[PDB]
Amino acid sequence: TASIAQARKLVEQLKMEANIDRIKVSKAAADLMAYCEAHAKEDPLLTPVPASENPFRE
Amino acid sequence: SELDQLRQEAEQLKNQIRDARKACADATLSQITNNIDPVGRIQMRTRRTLRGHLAKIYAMHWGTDSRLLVSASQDGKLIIWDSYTTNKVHAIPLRSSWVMTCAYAPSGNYVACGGLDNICSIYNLKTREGNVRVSRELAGHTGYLSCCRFLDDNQIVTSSGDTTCALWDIETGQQTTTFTGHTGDVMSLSLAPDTRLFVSGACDASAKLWDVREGMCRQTFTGHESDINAICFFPNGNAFATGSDDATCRLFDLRADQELMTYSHDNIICGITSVSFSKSGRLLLAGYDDFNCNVWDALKADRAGVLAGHDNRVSCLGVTDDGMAVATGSWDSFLKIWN
Amino acid sequence: KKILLPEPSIRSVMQKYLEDRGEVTFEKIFSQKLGYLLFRDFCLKHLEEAKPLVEFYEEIKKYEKLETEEERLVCSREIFDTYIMKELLACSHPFSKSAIEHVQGHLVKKQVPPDLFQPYIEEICQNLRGDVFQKFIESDKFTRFCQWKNVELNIHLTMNDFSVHRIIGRGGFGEVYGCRKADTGKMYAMKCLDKKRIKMKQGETLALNERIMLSLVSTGDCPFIVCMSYAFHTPDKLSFILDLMNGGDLHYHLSQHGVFSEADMRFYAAEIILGLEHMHNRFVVYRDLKPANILLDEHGHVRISDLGLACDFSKKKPHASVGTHGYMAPEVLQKGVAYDSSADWFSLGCMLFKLLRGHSPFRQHKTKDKHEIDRMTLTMAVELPDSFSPELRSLLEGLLQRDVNRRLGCLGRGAQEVKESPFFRSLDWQMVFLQKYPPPLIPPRTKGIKLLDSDQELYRNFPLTISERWQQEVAETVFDTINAETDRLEARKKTKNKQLGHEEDYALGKDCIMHGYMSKMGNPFLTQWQRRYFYLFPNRLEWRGEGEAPQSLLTMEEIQSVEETQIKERKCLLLKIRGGKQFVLQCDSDPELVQWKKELRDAYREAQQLVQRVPKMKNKPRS
Ligand SMILES: CC1=C(C(=O)Nc2ccc3[nH]ncc3c2)[C@H](c2ccc(F)c(C(=O)NCCc3c(C)cccc3C)c2)NC(=O)N1
Numbered sequence A: 001t002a003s004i005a006q007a008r009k010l011v012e013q014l015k016m017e018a019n020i021d022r023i024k025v026s027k028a029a030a031d032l033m034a035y036c037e038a039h040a041k042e043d044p045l046l047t048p049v050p051a052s053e054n055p056f057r058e
Numbered sequence B: 001s002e003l004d005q006l007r008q009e010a011e012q013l014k015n016q017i018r019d020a021r022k023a024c025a026d027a028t029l030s031q032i033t034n035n036i037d038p039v040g041r042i043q044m045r046t047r048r049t050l051r052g053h054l055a056k057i058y059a060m061h062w063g064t065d066s067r068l069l070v071s072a073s074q075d076g077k078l079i080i081w082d083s084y085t086t087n088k089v090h091a092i093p094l095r096s097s098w099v100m101t102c103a104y105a106p107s108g109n110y111v112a113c114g115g116l117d118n119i120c121s122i123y124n125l126k127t128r129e130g131n132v133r134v135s136r137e138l139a140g141h142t143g144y145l146s147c148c149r150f151l152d153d154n155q156i157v158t159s160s161g162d163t164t165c166a167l168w169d170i171e172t173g174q175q176t177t178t179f180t181g182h183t184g185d186v187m188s189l190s191l192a193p194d195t196r197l198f199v200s201g202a203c204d205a206s207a208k209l210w211d212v213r214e215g216m217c218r219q220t221f222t223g224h225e226s227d228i229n230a231i232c233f234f235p236n237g238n239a240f241a242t243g244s245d246d247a248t249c250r251l252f253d254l255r256a257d258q259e260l261m262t263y264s265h266d267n268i269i270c271g272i273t274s275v276s277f278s279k280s281g282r283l284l285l286a287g288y289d290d291f292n293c294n295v296w297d298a299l300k301a302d303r304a305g306v307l308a309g310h311d312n313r314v315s316c317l318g319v320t321d322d323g324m325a326v327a328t329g330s331w332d333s334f335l336k337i338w339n
Numbered sequence C: 001k002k003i004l005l006p007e008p009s010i011r012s013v014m015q016k017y018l019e020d021r022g023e024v025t026f027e028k029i030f031s032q033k034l035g036y037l038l039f040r041d042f043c044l045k046h047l048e049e050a051k052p053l054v055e056f057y058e059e060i061k062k063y064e065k066l067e068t069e070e071e072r073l074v075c076s077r078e079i080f081d082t083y084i085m086k087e088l089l090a091c092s093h094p095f096s097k098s099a100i101e102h103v104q105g106h107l108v109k110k111q112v113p114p115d116l117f118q119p120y121i122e123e124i125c126q127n128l129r130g131d132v133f134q135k136f137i138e139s140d141k142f143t144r145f146c147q148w149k150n151v152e153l154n155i156h157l158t159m160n161d162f163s164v165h166r167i168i169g170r171g172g173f174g175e176v177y178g179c180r181k182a183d184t185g186k187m188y189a190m191k192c193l194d195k196k197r198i199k200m201k202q203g204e205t206l207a208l209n210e211r212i213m214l215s216l217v218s219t220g221d222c223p224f225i226v227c228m229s230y231a232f233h234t235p236d237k238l239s240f241i242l243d244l245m246n247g248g249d250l251h252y253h254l255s256q257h258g259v260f261s262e263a264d265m266r267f268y269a270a271e272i273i274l275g276l277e278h279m280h281n282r283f284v285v286y287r288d289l290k291p292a293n294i295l296l297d298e299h300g301h302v303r304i305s306d307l308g309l310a311c312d313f314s315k316k317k318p319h320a321s322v323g324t325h326g327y328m329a330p331e332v333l334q335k336g337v338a339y340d341s342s343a344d345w346f347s348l349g350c351m352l353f354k355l356l357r358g359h360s361p362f363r364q365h366k367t368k369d370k371h372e373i374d375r376m377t378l379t380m381a382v383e384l385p386d387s388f389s390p391e392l393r394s395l396l397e398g399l400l401q402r403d404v405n406r407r408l409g410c411l412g413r414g415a416q417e418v419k420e421s422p423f424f425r426s427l428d429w430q431m432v433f434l435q436k437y438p439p440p441l442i443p444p445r446t447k448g449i450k451l452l453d454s455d456q457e458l459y460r461n462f463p464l465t466i467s468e469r470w471q472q473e474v475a476e477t478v479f480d481t482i483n484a485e486t487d488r489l490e491a492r493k494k495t496k497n498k499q500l501g502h503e504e505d506y507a508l509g510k511d512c513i514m515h516g517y518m519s520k521m522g523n524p525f526l527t528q529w530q531r532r533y534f535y536l537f538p539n540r541l542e543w544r545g546e547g548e549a550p551q552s553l554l555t556m557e558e559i560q561s562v563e564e565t566q567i568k569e570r571k572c573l574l575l576k577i578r579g580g581k582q583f584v585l586q587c588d589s590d591p592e593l594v595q596w597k598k599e600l601r602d603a604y605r606e607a608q609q610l611v612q613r614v615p616k617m618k619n620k621p622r623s
């Protein structure tokens, strides 16, 4: 803690973490919702599949 | 004093980050997803049970072929299972009994594992000789190996109780990059699908986003009240989920730089060991120290399902690249495959 | 019936058991007959570097034993020529200039004492302790050592281990029998003492003491003391296994032959002295020296027996009136007055006087009064008859000195003083020691007492094996044939491993802490023991029956305690497991029990210490 250099490092790190581009949660949300919707077709656990194409039934 | 100033300045910058974040909290994910239909019945069933480990199971990883997987056990072995058949392709007697983690390489040519020996042992599967030998003993961590994931068949990332993570060159055995920032044992890592980033969860209750190729932490996510024991990327690579000893999972969004969603219920007191998304990320699966895996709705936060076929702790889990299936591994000595 | 070595697997436990006790040093293996025996078979046959060394040690050993100087003249040259000169001429003679010089310099002076090559002994050892020794350790010969040692440290004796035969002596507390130890066929005496008959006459000390004494005197293979190889008991009896003397005692032979000529008496004293010397060098006084404690072997040679009333003084000094009336010194009879070696020498004289004269010197007109003899001895130098020679006269005077400050064999060289009396002028003492003198006489061919816990506790550390005596016993009987028989069994099973192909060793290339057979309870309901091959690892104990790999285990986390328990009067390990469950283990031998207990204990502690610092491994709260 009392190391001057670690406190500097810590601070430069927070600077790097502070000055990023953030998006509104609303858009970030929508983008996840979007992804989810655009890929729910391809998701065997989201739609129970026919046993035919399901390697774990027969 | 310069130290005293740097302390204040870190403090301002913590606050500046907190306000920067609140400036994006225009809506919640919950709000945004109030429309979409629920997900309904997620009733999955044990297809295979994987019997062989003599003691607790600590971890597992699916091959990219969505068929094979390695699991690491207190019995001091790795078993690479063909999950279709339940046949042990390989059983690998480890040199240290204290294995905690293991990873299947993308190619499926190698696996890795390690634990209280503070070493990431790389096992090679196909020689021309047709043998399973220790090809590298990646040493440098000063604490247990907690997780490791191959980038390809020659770079691999590790995590460790020494609070650090690292990137290695297998061929040479060098620790080519070191990722520092965490203040407690690092417990889990997850690679982004592009693999130019990875996130790590730790006993400091924070998770961190790192650039593989640059060696630094870009973002630090907090909010958990206890150890982050597991972490997984959302499949598109702009969010991840964590599981913790505080009994919640959470979804953190990268570009918004913050928590969107806590997955929790007052009924659940036990901590989470492991998380993973379904292929579309819609489902967030978590292993718990109550013996169950809960299937959560990533978008709505409703609990949507329960895998309940283990007698001790669910210690690890995973979804196949192909989406088809879910392994759960457990302290009861078994892996069960589910869909 | 006969000795059965454990399989070479036993090495895992023993090496550790011995390491823990510090016994895998060259010093400690090499000085054990079987240790030596194996260490050489190893050097001589399985290492070009050490063959010459041992060969050299052995030849010096043979040299030490040569009797003639005219023989030592011969052998010293040959030894010098073969092990010293020649190796010098090829610079492969790795010993200090000092040693070479010492020998060479003596050879040209032609001075050939038996310790001629003592400086090479020390240094051959120097070469052999080290890399030579560590390779020995690595070899199957050290395995063989562990196997034999396993046998040693697991000796438990019972009358059953012996074939008792005729009675050869009775006393107050029991009887003495001739017997043969089944194992090896070695003839011994067995002295039994009935514990009841003991408590009765309150002789719990005499017994307990005879044992401690025997245990001090019995190293060194003294041919003039009836030493002990073993001691065990039953709840009823005490057992001492002792050198077998079938010629009875002098007290009887005095009767039968009558008083002895001086020359005949010279023989007995010679040998008796060497016995005394032996004890006295181990700070033990016999205190009770008289004709009836001098037993004759088959050939007429004698030994001192029955250390009941003997007494250690390596620290504190005795003072009490103990011994038989007629042979006790003044400073013995004189209560208060401390003393040491002195008394025996006194008794010695009393005793020799008796063999010449038919009665103790302090026993005129065949008085039978204890008090009468006592006081005369206290102050009255003895009437030494007309017939006694001056050499004798001198010797008795010397011995029967009432003044201990000027008593023959009490002036700081002990035995040696007495060997120099003109009485023994004519004797070579090595010849006495080698028992080469012709012996004069060749021998011809009710209570209601109860036994409490507090009684039996007195004899708790009575049991004992003398390692030297047992190894010697083994060395000369079955050691060689047993080694072949076992060698054959092992190298057979090397083949039935190689055909069947189990030729990988499950304990290698990991972190196995230790392994070897033990037995557990298989069925909870049934309670019988299955013998299984266990492997301890830092975090689990795995076991397996034949063929198959381990398909079960305990984790060091599960284990809460490790403890001894009796089961069907067998000592066993009782592991308590976390659920409330238990687990029980029987080991094949005492050291295996000591080790598994220690190592299981150590490993469970370790494991739980370690697990507690590992968030993914530790237990978390549940409600
Ligand atoms: C040397 C000796 C006896 C004896 O024969 N001992 C013996 C020892 C080792 C041997 N190896 N091969 C043969 C052999 C024989 C024999 C003997 C045997 C057994 C004994 F228990 C004793 C003994 O302890 N006598 C004690 C005397 C005594 C006391 C003090 C009190 C009351 C009654 C009595 C008889 C004595 N008698 C004896 O006088 N001395």
Ligand SMILES: [Mg+2]
Residues within 6 Å of the ligand: C318, C319, C320, C321, C330, C331, C332, C333, C334, C335, C336, C337, C338, C339
């Ligand atoms: Mg006295």
